[PDB]
Amino acid sequence: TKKRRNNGRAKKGRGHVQPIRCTNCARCVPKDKAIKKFVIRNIVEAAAVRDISEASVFDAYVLPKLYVKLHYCVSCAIHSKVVRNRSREARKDRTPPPRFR
Amino acid sequence: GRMHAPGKGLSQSALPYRRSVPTWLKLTSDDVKEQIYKLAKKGLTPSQIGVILRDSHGVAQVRFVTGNKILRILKSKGLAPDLPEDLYHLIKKAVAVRKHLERNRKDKDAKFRLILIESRIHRLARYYKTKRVLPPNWKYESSTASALV
Amino acid sequence: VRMNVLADALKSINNAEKRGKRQVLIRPCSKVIVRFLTVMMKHGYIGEFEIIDDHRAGKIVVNLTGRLNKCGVISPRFDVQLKDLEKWQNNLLPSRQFGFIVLTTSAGIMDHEEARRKHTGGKILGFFF
Amino acid sequence: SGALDVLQMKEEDVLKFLAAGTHLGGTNLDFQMEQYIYKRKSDGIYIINLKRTWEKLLLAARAIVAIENPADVSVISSRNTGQRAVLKFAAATGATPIAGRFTPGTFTNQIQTAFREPRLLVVTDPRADHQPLTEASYVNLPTIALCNTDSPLRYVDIAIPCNNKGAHSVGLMWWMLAREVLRMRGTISREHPWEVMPDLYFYRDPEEIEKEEQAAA
Amino acid sequence: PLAKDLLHPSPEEEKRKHKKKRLVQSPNSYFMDVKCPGCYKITTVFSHAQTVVLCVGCSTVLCQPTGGKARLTEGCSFRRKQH
Amino acid sequence: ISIKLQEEERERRDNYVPEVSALDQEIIEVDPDTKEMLKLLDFGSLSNLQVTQPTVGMNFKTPRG
Amino acid sequence: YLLRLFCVGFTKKRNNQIRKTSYAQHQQVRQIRKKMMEIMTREVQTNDLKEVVNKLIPDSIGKDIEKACQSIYPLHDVFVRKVKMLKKPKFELGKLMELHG
RNA sequence: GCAAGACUGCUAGCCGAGUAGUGUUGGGUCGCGAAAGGCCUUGUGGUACUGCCUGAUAGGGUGCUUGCGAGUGCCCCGGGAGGUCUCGUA
RNA sequence: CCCCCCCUCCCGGGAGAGCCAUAGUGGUCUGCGGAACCGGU
RNA sequence: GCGCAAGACGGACCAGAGCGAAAGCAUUUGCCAAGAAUGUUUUCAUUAAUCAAGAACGAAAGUCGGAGGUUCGAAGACGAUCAGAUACCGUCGUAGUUCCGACCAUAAACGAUGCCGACCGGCGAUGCGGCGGCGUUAUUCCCAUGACCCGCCGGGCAGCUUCCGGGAAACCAAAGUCUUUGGGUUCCGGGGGGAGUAUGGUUGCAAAGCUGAAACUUAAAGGAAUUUGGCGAAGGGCACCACC
Numbered sequence A: 001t002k003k004r005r006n007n008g009r010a011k012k013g014r015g016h017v018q019p020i021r022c023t024n025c026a027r028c029v030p031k032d033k034a035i036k037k038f039v040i041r042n043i044v045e046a047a048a049v050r051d052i053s054e055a056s057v058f059d060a061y062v063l064p065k066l067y068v069k070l071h072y073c074v075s076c077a078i079h080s081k082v083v084r085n086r087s088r089e090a091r092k093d094r095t096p097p098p099r100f101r
Numbered sequence B: 001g002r003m004h005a006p007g008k009g010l011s012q013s014a015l016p017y018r019r020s021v022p023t024w025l026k027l028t029s030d031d032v033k034e035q036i037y038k039l040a041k042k043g044l045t046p047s048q049i050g051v052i053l054r055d056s057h058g059v060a061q062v063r064f065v066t067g068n069k070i071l072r073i074l075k076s077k078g079l080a081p082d083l084p085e086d087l088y089h090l091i092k093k094a095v096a097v098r099k100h101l102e103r104n105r106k107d108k109d110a111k112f113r114l115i116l117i118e119s120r121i122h123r124l125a126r127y128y129k130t131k132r133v134l135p136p137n138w139k140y141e142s143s144t145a146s147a148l149v
Numbered sequence C: 001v002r003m004n005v006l007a008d009a010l011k012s013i014n015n016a017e018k019r020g021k022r023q024v025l026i027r028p029c030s031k032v033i034v035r036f037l038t039v040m041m042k043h044g045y046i047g048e049f050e051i052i053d054d055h056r057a058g059k060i061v062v063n064l065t066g067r068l069n070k071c072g073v074i075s076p077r078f079d080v081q082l083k084d085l086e087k088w089q090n091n092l093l094p095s096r097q098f099g100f101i102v103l104t105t106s107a108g109i110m111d112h113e114e115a116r117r118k119h120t121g122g123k124i125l126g127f128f129f
Numbered sequence D: 001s002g003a004l005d006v007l008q009m010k011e012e013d014v015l016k017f018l019a020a021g022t023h024l025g026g027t028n029l030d031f032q033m034e035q036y037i038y039k040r041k042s043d044g045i046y047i048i049n050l051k052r053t054w055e056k057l058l059l060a061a062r063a064i065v066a067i068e069n070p071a072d073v074s075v076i077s078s079r080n081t082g083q084r085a086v087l088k089f090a091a092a093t094g095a096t097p098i099a100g101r102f103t104p105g106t107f108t109n110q111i112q113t114a115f116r117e118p119r120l121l122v123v124t125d126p127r128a129d130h131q132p133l134t135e136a137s138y139v140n141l142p143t144i145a146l147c148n149t150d151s152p153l154r155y156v157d158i159a160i161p162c163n164n165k166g167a168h169s170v171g172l173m174w175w176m177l178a179r180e181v182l183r184m185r186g187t188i189s190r191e192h193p194w195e196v197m198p199d200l201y202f203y204r205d206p207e208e209i210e211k212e213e214q215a216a217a
Numbered sequence E: 001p002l003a004k005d006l007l008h009p010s011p012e013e014e015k016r017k018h019k020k021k022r023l024v025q026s027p028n029s030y031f032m033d034v035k036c037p038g039c040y041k042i043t044t045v046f047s048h049a050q051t052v053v054l055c056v057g058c059s060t061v062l063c064q065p066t067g068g069k070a071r072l073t074e075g076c077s078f079r080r081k082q083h
Numbered sequence F: 001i002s003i004k005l006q007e008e009e010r011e012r013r014d015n016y017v018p019e020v021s022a023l024d025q026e027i028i029e030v031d032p033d034t035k036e037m038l039k040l041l042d043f044g045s046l047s048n049l050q051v052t053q054p055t056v057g058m059n060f061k062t063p064r065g
Numbered sequence G: 001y002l003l004r005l006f007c008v009g010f011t012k013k014r015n016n017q018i019r020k021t022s023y024a025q026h027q028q029v030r031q032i033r034k035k036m037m038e039i040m041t042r043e044v045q046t047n048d049l050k051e052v053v054n055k056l057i058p059d060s061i062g063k064d065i066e067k068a069c070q071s072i073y074p075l076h077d078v079f080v081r082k083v084k085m086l087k088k089p090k091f092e093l094g095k096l097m098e099l100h101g
Numbered sequence H: 001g002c003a004a005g006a007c008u009g010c011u012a013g014c015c016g017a018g019u020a021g022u023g024u025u026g027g028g029u030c031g032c033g034a035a036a037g038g039c040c041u042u043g044u045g046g047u048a049c050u051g052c053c054u055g056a057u058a059g060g061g062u063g064c065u066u067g068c069g070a071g072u073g074c075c076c077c078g079g080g081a082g083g084u085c086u087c088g089u090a
Numbered sequence I: 001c002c003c004c005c006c007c008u009c010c011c012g013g014g015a016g017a018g019c020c021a022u023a024g025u026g027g028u029c030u031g032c033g034g035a036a037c038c039g040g041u
Numbered sequence J: 001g002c003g004c005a006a007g008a009c010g011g012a013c014c015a016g017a018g019c020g021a022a023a024g025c026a027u028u029u030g031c032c033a034a035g036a037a038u039g040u041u042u043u044c045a046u047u048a049a050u051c052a053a054g055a056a057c058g059a060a061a062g063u064c065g066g067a068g069g070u071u072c073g074a075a076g077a078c079g080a081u082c083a084g085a086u087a088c089c090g091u092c093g094u095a096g097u098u099c100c101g102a103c104c105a106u107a108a109a110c111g112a113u114g115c116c117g118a119c120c121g122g123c124g125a126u127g128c129g130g131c132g133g134c135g136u137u138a139u140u141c142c143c144a145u146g147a148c149c150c151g152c153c154g155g156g157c158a159g160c161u162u163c164c165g166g167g168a169a170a171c172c173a174a175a176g177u178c179u180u181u182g183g184g185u186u187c188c189g190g191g192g193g194g195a196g197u198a199u200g201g202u203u204g205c206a207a208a209g210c211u212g213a214a215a216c217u218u219a220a221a222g223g224a225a226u227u228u229g230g231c232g233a234a235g236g237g238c239a240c241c242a243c244c
């Protein structure tokens, strides 16, 4: 039984792409098949941001962020509840969930 | 589709239905004939001759101002070469590819393109032999690379 | 490449009739096509069909009345006899009250009934019903 | 519709068309509405030809008055914009309205209380209201549509090019259709128009009902 | 369309289509003539030159080879000829 | 369910009409494309119609991603 | 003094643009790189270290870069990302005193 | 040669003058651009404002705001009065 | 004196390359006839 | 934290994007050679399509000879897990991994769908080349130039939708134009095991690659989808025969 419209990745005219490595795993999943994440994280999220700011010598100093990205294998991503399964009638929904915060 | 390329193309000339001499042009046959004579003794191939005539002298085509094409005129004079121009260019391209592959050893796709152009040379050679413009003892090899350049 | 223009023409007019277009286009043209379309219009499955002429390749515009069901081509070019065409029309035609078999004889492109009444036969072009 | 002399458009109908905004279309373009769009103007808006609109209005009005039973034609509305128009049109002409949640058990289910099979169906828009099209497919029932240049056309006998995003345009088109069908039936004579009010079919948003209630006595 | 008439449509319909999809077969390119502003002799040139051409008298180059139609030298008067 | 009385704000509202029809505006805002549309149907020009400038700015078709 | 100046550049998305891709061809990038190398090597080989540093404390090289490269494809973000030194001349004291005044 | 019409850049009285200087995309009739000096009727009515900044009252960067988003506010000189503008506070 | 100040409101004087316009103002387009045709220098 | 030295690799930029016949291909620069598409009122004029013989290329792993081999890491060595692990896990670790040659021609080398050519609907996008048309950007006026926008043309990866139509259904704009059965052409299969097995030939230093049985047993082996299952599957709600 064929499952999807595509083959499950972003290979449609190439045949082979470069392999990448997972973060919590080490599987050599291809780049067009894996799951990426462009996460933005501050140095202090909500824990002691006022304690950091009031201890700062420089007036009007803003904390920087950490723009790092991670690569997940499919089993590693489904174990960490990153992606979730759904039904067949809504499986053709490429649109991401909405962003608010 | 093409006979070696994977893709299909559509790009060629398209003569109009109107088979007539252009009324705005005032040219006879003798002046354009000696223009063919001069541009042929200058040392150019007939495709470039048709290009330079329809570029400079404003002629639509020679077939609409005469009753024959370029190579028939050149063989009527006798200045047409014994080797056809497309076969000459294909042999020159094959000689250049083999000369490049002499010094570049590990080059697989260039060798494949050499095989393809040798197949083209073979197909045109069988066609030109069976239409009685070349003698049957003619045969293309690598050692003829300096013979028919 | 294209090596049977009549099969392509009949398949194109069959597809365009099944969709229901009124005026169709055929990119090649030949003697066999124009005599086949005249015997079409004489027996009454089409209307006023046109043709454009140029010095390269003519095209044919055919008017339709919807009085056709399916119009196929025998490929390759088979030959029949007078004691043989009944075998073809029994296993090919949908009935004997309608459906015609066209064939090329010595007198030209013509259908099987006047070939039967004139007692001659030859190679077979196609069929329509 | 265009074969005779008196059936052509009048002088104030063009003014009502240009006032109500019955000439501008959406953003895209369909492949069945190609013969009503003449030329694409700026801001990605296509223009319908108003002569075509008036002509198809005459043809649809003729098809409506062709039957001799006034209570056998049905009008359908789904969205909250055009609601009073079809109701007062059925009050004037004699039609049967269904406004708001067209139940699917009307033309097919023959045991229900709301079982009425009509002869002609008039839909406000096929895209916004497609349920009576599917049920009209299952019985001998033609449809009349007020379609826009972005509305898909399917199971439609007579198509009216319209701008169905403003309530004034839909109400004025219903007003002219009612005017034409009563002139063709023989109630209002052709030599004198009955044009007393086009705002009988105009819908206004729920601000203006309170505003006009406070303004009036 | 159902009864789409392919006998004689509007000329915009043959304009928007391809040069070979057109039911009457005719190309789109044309012949033209153009001069030099400081000269008397005027010569003709095709719309797609594909070689660099200079006007007669060996004074100033005229056209430039492009992928499409040949662009002309700045400050030159021309008109399309037809027959 | 229907209500017998809720102080006059019922289906009697679909009876009245404003005294101004809101259609006889003295100035008609018409683009020149619509002017060349209507110059060949039944009219050629109107005194109550003002020909406006074609509001052609930059573009249209705003994106959503 | 021998240096190794690095540069980086990102293209500018127009406010009128609707297409989200906004890439550039390889020859455009090649000619931009050639112009960037020529402009960057022109401003250093003519002057000493102090003058090119005083030109490098504001954005003057970068201002020249988005002055000269917007004619081929509009780009907005160019910083001199890293300057690496390789070799120094013979050690002396007058230069060290004259950089301090 | 006749008939008058629609559009058109600069100057603030004119010559000086589109003149030095001024630009990298490439040229063009090529933008912006004073003068010194000299000469004449002796030099425009109604109509808005101006966050430094590269190129103007334009294009292209880019703020302060109740901490959060926003309506108002932000050229040189002078006179009086006041010293906590507002809409909801994840 | 709430002030070294600074800010806001009310009222005036100066440059501008906005609109309707003035004096010196440069070109494009809108019709009519070159008595009427065929070649050489 | 500062220098030296070796080897490997070119992230983020990188996308349902490009190129190539496929296997595959990402630091800049310099040289050589080839090619699709676009445009053409240029040239030869049937040179055409598919292909038994035969031929080229071909991921990793494998074998033969070398300098040199960072990191990772078959077989193996040492501890914990475990009723029992010579498995999962950790630390070392040889051959290998990279380069120059010499070879076998095997993958889910799969789009599990042969090539060419004709036809049958739409929508909105991206990539190349050409084309027409408002308005902005490279000292303020023009020109084509690079970019922005609106439409058109041809080829390619495509996406959405469609009682066109097809299919056992999953699904397909081809897997369609098929009992209303014939466009041209190459390879290839008849219930399931035995068995890609033994023999024979063939190539190879080497592993194996190609070719390719018989006896006997067997009435099922298989493909699609539905109904409550049953999940150390996910997500909601309830119970003191559950908890705080």
Ligand SMILES: [Zn+2]
Pocket (backbone or CB within 6 Å): A022, A023, A024, A025, A026, A072, A073, A074, A075, A076, A077
């Ligand atoms: Zn993982």
